[model samples]
Target chain A: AWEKQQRKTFTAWCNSHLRKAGTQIENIEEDFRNGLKLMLLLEVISGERLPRPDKGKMRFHKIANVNKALDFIASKGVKLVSIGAEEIVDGNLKMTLGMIWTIILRFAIQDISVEETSAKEGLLLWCQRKTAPYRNVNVQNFHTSWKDGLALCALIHRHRPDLIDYAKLRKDDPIGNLNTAFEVAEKYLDIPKMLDAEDIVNTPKPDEKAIMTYVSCFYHAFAG
Target chain B: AWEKQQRKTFTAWCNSHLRKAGTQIENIEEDFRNGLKLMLLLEVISGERLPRPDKGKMRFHKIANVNKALDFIASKGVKLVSIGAEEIVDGNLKMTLGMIWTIILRFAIQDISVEETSAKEGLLLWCQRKTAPYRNVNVQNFHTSWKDGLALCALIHRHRPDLIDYAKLRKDDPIGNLNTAFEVAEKYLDIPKMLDAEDIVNTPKPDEKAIMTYVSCFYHAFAG
Candidate 1:
């Protein structure tokens, strides 16, 4: 279930970049298997075009094209562990999700930090600065601290005070606060709503991967 | 004029290997400009298929395809000096001829030596061993010694005595001896008649590139 949300979030993130190349991904596994779109994604992210891809639909052709994308990644000093072109072509969901995470970490979230802080540290510090003034919203980690939904609301409202009235919002109403922030971010800010209020509040221990994906959307939308 | 003869000889040499892949190169200038045949030639010679070539006929696509072939050559520890994909794509005859010669030296003639001798030394030694018994034939250098054509006849007849009765051939009739050996080699052994008898007998300093190109055919056919 956590992986499913991440799939949508990562796909949405990729779509934002792929839009520059005039394409979109509806399904990560099937869409990226051909490597044409994947290569285009690398091009837009790295700002360099790869060799024109193989036109044939033969199995070898697909493998070769995907291998080109993988090779490009490897050339950039990115280490891809275990996952390769074959696993992606075979539509292995776990490996596919893992591969995209590697891309996101390198291209999207890895550099979103400031002042000698790591990517994770920069993100946490950015959030703590925004939510510092809000009541009961301590942006400590991407885990349990976000359970009350106050951090989510503070993040959105901090950027645009017109979006959410943080003054009237109560921490007791976790679901409403969570849904309002998520929907407003999607509807007005154009960030995809990838997390559910029920899971964020009810589970007590929210997923770090899910929160990071959702939080990175805010970074890219507002600050990055 | 010398380069023209080397072009045909090299094309025939490439065709002999490309035959395994079910293709041919009719014009090195225009045909290889697109890089399709060039990549295929590398595949046959190196015995490894490249990533499927770009299907587009755009300028960038052509350059990219040719670059792939060049990169493969470099990966094999062969240094391509000065020449690159642009030269081939633009059909620069001098650079194109130079590029192909580099390939021939590395792939074809580089390994055709015996004992402790170099490729050039080994080739000369091989011819000397075959022509040692024939009259007026000193398999000395690839240059002046081959101008008489008696050495050419001796090399071919040594392998298949039924092809030529070396005893009937005389060194004084350079034109007739040259033509007979060249024609018989083409007709019987399928070696391309790259050199004219008139040029071989008239020119005191024969072209080593053209001669080696022609001679390598016999090695690949009979010995390599």
Candidate 2:
């Protein structure tokens, strides 16, 4: 039990820490999507990155095309927010970037739709909408949670690749299995509740504006 | 929204601001009850308190009774754990403290009862079980959540007295009104998920010890 709790806290550390842009980079399409308010709660309000579920893994290669993506949005070169964009704020960019990736996750990676609206607009409202409001169903029913469960599994792995054993993710490894391993860690993925619409809309304007800037960059790269 | 945000930041100021070891009191039992984890997350993690929805009234008297309840429990000098009293460094205390006030809430304030379990042992297992794994008719039908809701309402009011119109809460708020208010906020109350039995029992020893200390204090004041 003691060991597992350590792991939970540690994993929590990894989830919050990895991939954050020093001002900026990658990840969490869905978890980031659903976690918007918690993000604000932890990052903006809590005012610190959620503790690394512990610490960083040894440096490896860049996970995403950071420089390339920056150039893509930079070429659009328009002042995105109600205000013009300078570089994104130092600590604040993590939320902006995290949300940006969620946009790519929805449209690009997972292919969720935002018909009339741009992904940026959708984020303002979409995330505020509840993720799993299925009161009558067991949240485990993939009928709703399957995709989210997968995204969350990815997030858990992002923090600690060792935990997921991607090599063992396939074919029920007597030693490791993705689905089996997925379930244990995925519980953390289950978001509890979202803010009431009032809370969502009322998110302080500055925070929302930072988000708007990130969302616009995504539109520039994709829709624009 | 900015002002409210400021207040939240400020109160978070108070919560983290206090000795935490400083100890205390309160009238917003319900909000405090629902917010325990958030309280700690704010204090221990974010190191802040929930912002008051409304700014404080002139002479703030007793918000810390809830803490004094703890001081009261601490004074009792009991070691609460494992069906006996030894220091409780097991995962059990988190839910246990969570459940303790819940019981104080159930039987004391409202005289409500669960048909079978006494609120005491119910503390042992019932709440340790995840809350919103709901069954029939919208978890909205707090057919079960009835009592716990009133407690939560008071809690919400405590931090943000402006939100709940304490001036109105005083009159024959109506026994039925409790059920109604409970229903509204109560929908939000359903705890989405909890760590499973193994997760619960296996909570790291250190986590449980802190929780046990709190739980022991709560039980000492409310039950013992």
Candidate 3:
């Protein structure tokens, strides 16, 4: 009964998590788009050596370029919905995933520079928002559901080699780097303890029920 | 040069500043005349206790009653002369002064329940063994010193009871209590800067002289 109540609370928390992230993204996008637009305008006016469109003001050109980039990203099965250049630059699946990876790596290093620490904390906040939608799922199911989570991280890492040092990562180590994301997922999603009660006719094991509930919840949650 | 050197270091740290009190009586003729020969016997037993008697132990019956106690104390005083209790206690005056006031008060209030937080620090250890000799000094001196310090703190209150709560004090108020001490001493100490200077000097100043000398020597050798 206690487990069921916890599961309900977890599910409710998860449902609300994505909405909070959306709100944050909206706020972040507004500020980020404005800042980027200003920078583009400034570079255009100054005729700086920064990347610029061949014709017209750089803001419009940059937006068109971002659209082309999104199309290419989608063709590559990136599973990202490009709301707009503002949305993509401000907050997106790839960037949010990178943010999560940054958070975990920062935690591991423990003594990154103050500026890096602040950046990592900001990324962690974004990751928390991203993960909030599946809070109620059991650990095992959460891992299976988050199969794309680490893949998204890998994709972001491939694109942003300047930001992430992939060579420093220990590949295939379950508790190190990449696979540790699953461990984190499991922790946040408390899997029900297994009960071995042979009494009665074919009673479903607690672990099995937990896993099913978690998977069902996750499936419904991120069902684009 | 010697006088100059002495004067340079003679900032109230001189032994002449200490005051000793009590009455001194010269003779014990009455004690010797009376049947109270115990004092004379004791004097004889403890050879170091009394003045050299011109007469034998039986002649003590010739002394008066008032002279007996005086004789006994005189003898005790003689014994105490070679080994002065005041000197023994006063030898540790600097440490004792700090211990009776600062350390005792500090430890008296610390919550020892939390072993990690409550463990005695280096300052605390210094404070405890600081006044071994002066441990037997009359409690009145201690009370007087403490009260003087507190009174100084009260003067600094300046209508701000929030800044200085002179009324109620507990174990946690060691630093606050010390502030009170400073407040009390401010009046007679006269120099307005004296109180402020006392606070600054009394605080744990690092051994910068030794540090600077060592650092300079190292740097010079490196330069050469």
Candidate 4:
């Protein structure tokens, strides 16, 4: 379910970047196989022109174009671990999602620096730092830490104190806190409510990537 | 000793890329402390303009500039693990070298692709595939595999057989094999003799990076 969520989110993110290139992907696995759109996406992301991609419909041409994309990524110092042109050509879902996630981690999430940590860690730190002064709010991992919604409320209240009353928010009312934070953030900060309060509260551990994506909106809204 | 060699080699490698940027670093640690030159190098390497850096000369400004550079690198999807703006600001040698090495590995070396492997692994596979048919020559690694120097001969011979007589070259005489291959490659293939025969044979383990750089020249001359 989270993978499905991630696919949509990542596609939207890709489209946000790709829109500037005057193109967008309808399907990541199928769209990128030819490497034409992938190369354009990379160029748009890196702001650098890559070698001319092979224009044939042959499998080898597809592979060659994909290889060019992979090589260009490596040149930027991104290590696509255990990923190859073949999986991309085959349109393996897991590999395809993993590749886009890595790309997002590198280009989108990783640049949000707070302290000297991994991009995920940096995002976490940004949350913790922002919510540190709030009462009953402990911004830990992206999982249960955000379930009760106080962290989200605290995050918004910390940045924009006028939005919500952090002191009155109680831990017992998970849905209310979530609702208030989501509504206030979406209304004022312009951050879309990416995750449902019920989904976050019911799930044992909500998807980190999904949560990170949601929280990242908060970060960009206030800090970015 | 290898570290010193790598420092010189990596510095030269950086300068080669930095020249077009209208600057060069005499000392990686010192020159990059301000984050001015480092950002320029990155701009040149990625061919993308970074955020306008802070122009103040204060320590905080330096840190801010360095932070911008790090963030720019992360925007490219390059994960700079355990590296921070403070380390670069302090001009820590080990960290500085490690940072540059990561940069080199990413921007300089990681783009080389042969098969489905890492940049280093790709270089090795390129050599292995080229030397697979040769007798008494096994291209196993960057260290002892080339001690006898037949692997080097085999690499050149596989690409340009007329450069050296592989059949007559005896592995028993490391110096002769090394000298013949180096001379032929330099004279004909235009690959500089980056390594000496004694360095490879006497040292328990020759530096992998040095050997990779030297062999990369061969790759570019013939295969690239």
**Interface root-mean-square deviation, each candidate:** 20.2, 14.3, 45.2, 12.0
Docking class of 3: incorrect
In angstroms, give how far residue B84 of model 3 lies from its true place: 64
Q: Model 2 segments beyond 4 Å from truth?
A: A1-14, A18-177, A184-224, B1-78, B81-173, B187-224
Q: Which whole-number lDDT from 0 to 100 does residue B128 have in model 2?
A: 30
Stretches > 4 Å off in candidate 1: A1-224
In model 1, the Cα lDDT at residue B75 comes to 83
Ranking by lDDT: 1, 4, 3, 2
Candidate 3 residues lying further than 4 Å off, grouped into runs, are: A1-142, A145-152, A171-224, B1-165, B168-224
| lDDT by residue (tens digit), candidate 2, B35-106 | 333233233322222332211222121223233333333333422222211111122333334434332333
Count of backbone clashes for each model? 0, 23, 22, 1
User: In order, what fnat does every candidate score?
Assistant: 0.00, 0.00, 0.00, 0.00
lDDT tens readout by residue for model 2, A1-224: 22222223222332333323221112322232223222333343223444222122221111122222333333433222321112222123344444343323332323224545444445433322322332321223212222222323333444445445443343223223324333334222321111122222233321332223322222223332
Model 1 lDDT per residue over A1-224, tens place:
67776777778778767876777788987898878888899999889878889999877888889898888887877899998899988878898888878877777667886667768788888888888898678878998988888899999888888778888889899899898898787546656567878877777687787788778888878974
Give the range of the ten consecutive residues with the poorest summed lDDT in model 1 chain B. Answer: B47-56
The single-chain TM-score for chain B of candidate 4 is 0.75
lDDT of 3 at A84: 53
Between candidates 1 and 2, the one scoring higher on TM-score is: 1
